[PDB]
Amino acid sequence: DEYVQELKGLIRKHIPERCEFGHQKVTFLSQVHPSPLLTEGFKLLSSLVELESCEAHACQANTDQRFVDVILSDNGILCPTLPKVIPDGFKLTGKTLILLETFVRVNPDEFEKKWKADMSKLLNLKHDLQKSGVTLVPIVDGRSNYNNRFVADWVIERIRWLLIEILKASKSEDQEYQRLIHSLSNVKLENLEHLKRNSLDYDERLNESLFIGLKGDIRESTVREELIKLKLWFKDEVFSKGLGKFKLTDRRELLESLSSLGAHLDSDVSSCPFCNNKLMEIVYNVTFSCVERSNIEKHYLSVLSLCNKIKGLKVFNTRRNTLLFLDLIMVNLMVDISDSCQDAIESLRKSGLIVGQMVMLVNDRVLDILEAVKLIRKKIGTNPNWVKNCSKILERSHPEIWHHLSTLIKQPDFNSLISIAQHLVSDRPIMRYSKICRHKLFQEMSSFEQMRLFKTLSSISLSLINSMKTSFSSRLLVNEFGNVRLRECYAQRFYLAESLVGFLFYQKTGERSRCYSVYLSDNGVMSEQGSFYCDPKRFFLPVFSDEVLAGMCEEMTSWLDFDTGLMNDTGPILRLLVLAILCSPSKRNQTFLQGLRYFLMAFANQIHHIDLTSKLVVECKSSSEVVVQRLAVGLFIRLLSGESDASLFFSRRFKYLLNVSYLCHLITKETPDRLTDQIKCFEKFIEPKVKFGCAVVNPSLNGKLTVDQEDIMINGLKKFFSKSLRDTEDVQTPGVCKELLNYCVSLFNRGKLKVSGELKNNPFRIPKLDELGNILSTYDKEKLVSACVSSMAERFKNLDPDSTDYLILKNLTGLTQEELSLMYEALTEEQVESFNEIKHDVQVALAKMADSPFGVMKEIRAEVSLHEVKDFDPDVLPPEVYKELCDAVYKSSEKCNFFLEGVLDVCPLGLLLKNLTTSSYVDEEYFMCFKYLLIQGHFDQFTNAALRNLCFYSEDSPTEFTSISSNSGNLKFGLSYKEQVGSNRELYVGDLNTKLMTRLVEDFSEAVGNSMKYTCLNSEKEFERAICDMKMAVNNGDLSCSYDHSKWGPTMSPALFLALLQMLELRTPVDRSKIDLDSVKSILKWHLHKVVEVPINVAEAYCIGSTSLSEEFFHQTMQLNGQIPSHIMSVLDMGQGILHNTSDLYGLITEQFLCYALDLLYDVIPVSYTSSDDQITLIKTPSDAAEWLEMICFHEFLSSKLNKFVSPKSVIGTFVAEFKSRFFVMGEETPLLTKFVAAALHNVKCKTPTQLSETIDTICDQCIANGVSTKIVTRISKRVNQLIRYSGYGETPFGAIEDQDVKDWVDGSRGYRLQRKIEAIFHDDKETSFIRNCARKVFNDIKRGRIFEENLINLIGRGGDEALTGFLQYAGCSEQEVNRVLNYRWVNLSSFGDLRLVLRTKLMTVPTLIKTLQSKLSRQSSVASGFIGFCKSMGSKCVRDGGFLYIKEVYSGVSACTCEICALKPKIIYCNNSLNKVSQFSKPILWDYFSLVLTNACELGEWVFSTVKEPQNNQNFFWAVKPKVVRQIEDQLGMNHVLQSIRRNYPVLFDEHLTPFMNDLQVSRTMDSGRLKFLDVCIALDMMNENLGIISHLLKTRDNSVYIVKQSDCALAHIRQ
Ligand SMILES: [Mn+2]
Ligand SMILES: [Zn+2]
Question: One Gene Ontology cellular component annotation (predicted)?
């Protein structure tokens, strides 16, 4: 015995920490025998691991291995007959359990699967336990390795190695040996030959149902003869009988059909867009009311801001009293202002911020004066001490920094207040809930009122976006049919002119859709403008884009300048259409505009589908879509009412109408409703499966099928492969005929198609699935609650303040009332609700840890007795089954033992329930207190094969597999949706194991396709070839067929791919071995038997509960057969985006076969390009295009015989060819302006102003690449700059991209336009010229002569002033030049680091060049809410120094001192002595200009040193240009070169935070092309400055390489050389 004897001596270095350790060690050491040794060794290992894991959580180790019922019986708990469960550790305290089960899994797959299966089994116990007993916190402590705190982490690996050596040495079955071995390794792809592949007496039926007719060896002449006969039959039995699928256009017929479907004539709506739409009407009213027509105000705004700041601290632990106190302060200061200066209450208020009988208050609230004084009247007489102590409480244990010297303590003089109140009479708002047209005929206004309409729309949209900003946890003082007289309504203001302002009143807070009321105020007289209903988070696009849209509309109008008289009739209607789309955002408008695009495509060409017009019509609702549909259809009929092809100008009309049709990108894509979208997604997923008739209900999820399930699966598979070549009744049904597949495969095998199997490079080299997209899943919620409760329990070594909430905010958002407020204000409304639920759960758990009903007047008998027995616990008890009034009156129960007198904020344990109940009773929240009363009322009331799978045994590991499973699951999936503009797309999310298998098959298919040629899906070279071929074919005038295939996802089946792969051979490159595709076929079978989990929300909505087949199916399977369906397994799914490359390969093979057939039959030359969903076929025909209809119909028929049905959107013609949304016309390419403009105006994802500027720069570069304009990009630049400025960051010299740019986005990077912006700041370019000359001198000195080295780097990191003065003295200067250059300064807020700010992110969580390099080494949220989070987070203590402070505090330290050099660019550039008070936030702009110039010279040549010289065309002649850059930095610039110089210069930064996960340092250390020419200094500059980003541009591609521009802009460019 070599290792057996050593085993006893090796464990001698063990600490007998516990009694059980020694108790088992004495048994171990005194017992040596091969049969019992291994079992007790495993037991000891697992025991020590679990003991350490639990003792990390203050466990009470379960040594007797007893159930939970027995341990509840040991203490005093009634037995509710719970399921029998053995927990690893239990801890009873008070009336709560802490149950934890631990395990160890080396690989992530088993770790995740075990974690899910253990969390579910613990969670299934709490429903039964809480019904008649205690509530438990479940902990699951999983470890990925065996390390612990009891051993030195050196003995465990050695003992495991020797133990597995013993196991593999001596034995005593088949798979248990392999499972023991597999569970002890460390780390461990295809070639799974270790598997067993045991049959099940079922897969044979699969064999003769899938492979009964596949041979793949047919000869060629027989195929030719059969195809000839088939064509002869089709000519005279299907085509001449009118059963085709494609038809000629007949322009007049299409125009009549469009006019009949779009322009409603059966509708009662009038032809005035303003009258039908509410928002449109309000915009019109405000515009035409405005167009045709003092230090106290600053003091009031400042004190209002101070009041908001003091209210943000919530230092009163109550909501009513705080609001009353702030109201008292505001009214006291109002009477203090109005006591003197009698011309104030009517001058700077009626023209400022006040309305009829209402004053603005804290928290953006507007309150009536009479109600305010009435509420202040209360709390007096009963609490005379209410004021004084409050005045005394703001000085002690308070910030004690308040300017309320007299406005605070002052008792409000009610006589003067009531005098002010009676000075003006009631004109309260009305808030209209739930007719002669006088609208001045929009077509007949001047060119000035329209821009005013756009400006008004922008202002109102900004007001809505700001209405989103109100704090969610705010309640009104007094709460509230068709008309309601407002008294405590929220309001927002928007300015229009000197006197009149606009108010926007609303009553609710959050992101939901509301009803707003718009009022005006001219000179104190408050009028009514209107009331409407909208969702605020859908109005972000027009927030400032009042000039971008005007610019694009003017350009599109100018596009029609070939007829003076057509643009005059199409301009105003186009503007009205754009404005109507902006004011009426909905998905139906998007769908209609997409239908318009497809109609245009069909109209331009010559052949189109017979079932096209049925895909254009979208039903109209609310009469707000009828107006936009009428406008769009009228535009289309007014434009394309002429002939086709042969015309003086037709390409311009097509361009204009295509751009009009992409107006649907203006409307956002953000799911108007989430539950509705989930329901629609589930419907779209499940309708075809049940229509086909093969959808089974809940399987076993273990690889076991009953006789009925396998029978229905086999029947479905037979029906799939039961189509004949002759029948025409099945053209739209899924299924593939075996004969044509045999023909295609046999013809592919004998190298006859354009592709063949001569492949090289041989290919074989914890989210819960039933809710996806939910902000916080059940698993995360329970984990968080358990963690918080465990931390609380271990801290109590009771009493508990509210600071516990702070703890929760550590785990939701990643990072002391300031910290709590900053963390709280970063949560969205739904996240706030989830946080409140977690709060309640934790508080209830602790209250339980700490340890009357005959109040019947209208309930208890039927209300709460059935409400508690209703859905789960009262934590989800709806407030609608019980009325509000009865809730309030039932709460009138007196104070008793259930209550306690006093708020008692400190709250010692044992009174949590009573304390929260009393506190919530004091405030307005009554239903929460009712729930608390409910919960306090207790109204919720030696074999080695089976006895070894309990401790750490990885029983669920893959060892043997069958045809339907792998003994490790059934390849579970999930359902979700991905937003698009037209309609949402399916999305399948998979577990880890199924993700690995899909990745394996995906890699194999990707390799096989990469061998082939004609696919263009993940190979840009083939896409470029397709683009060039399309361009030349359209130029020549050949036939182009754009084929978009319908239902590609939910139709194809893994069985089709199984048959195709069974019939293929895929010959090896140089071996000709006929690769065996066994593993691929096994994985494809596993896909064939996959499981898709239905969303839990859809099940709940259909259970609780308009006709739909999905709903009737769900009810039919509800209890008629079994239980609620939760899993759906079927034949034809091919999860969308799961088998993408395999589908591409199949489509390529079938398309090549079809092209061969067309060449064989009609003697044409087809060439096809496929992208796995859409394809383009370019057909060159010998020897006017109406005799090719038969060929097109035959092609469609043959495609339908395979599983490749053609959608009606497909078009065949000769005018325009489409592929991947890139339309080509004879001569040029269509620009698609509006798509790019709408993209630029959208996706404003802001985290820092610099990053926002960079993203907008990239988007604008891509925009100007496709010939948009140079007058539109400036307006987007202004919009981004104004969005930055409005956020409070203040304007900065760098900021967003430059204003007033030129065509020179080409041959210029981000640095060049930064340099241009700085040069534009200085007018006479004197100091800029001097710095440029110094830069040229330094550049020449480093290029030749006195060649320098890394010594210069030592100067860069010192600072800004020192670096500039050192470089000036190196070039050569004196004190005068240095002291003159260092005069210009700009304020750098991020001087001592970065802005401290938290954004609206998702829950559960150094120079930037390091982060970019780290990113290179490796491998749902809306826009308005994100921007509001940005603006709100940049108003708190953000900038750091020394400590944090505001931005306005820093900017208030500057002095005006406008002497000579602070007026060339106000609020941007200052002089030195003007920044004496704030000097640490002051850096020279000339240093950044110097760095920009040097870096630009390093990158794109030396021509950036010269001086700019200004030079001494129908706006429609486009032409293409190339970049004209010259580089001097070894342009190839491969990888592993920057890191070499960084290691040379910054070893400490290379060692730490850089390359931990790096395994090829040998190449990067052996001077791999080290010591570059300029890279020594051209990398240090970016390390210090945060807005150059030259490294990120070094290792990238231009991404455009071409720019289409105008003759108008190239002649206005600036010459610099
Ligand atoms: Mn297409
Ligand atoms: Zn009207």
Answer: host cell cytoplasm
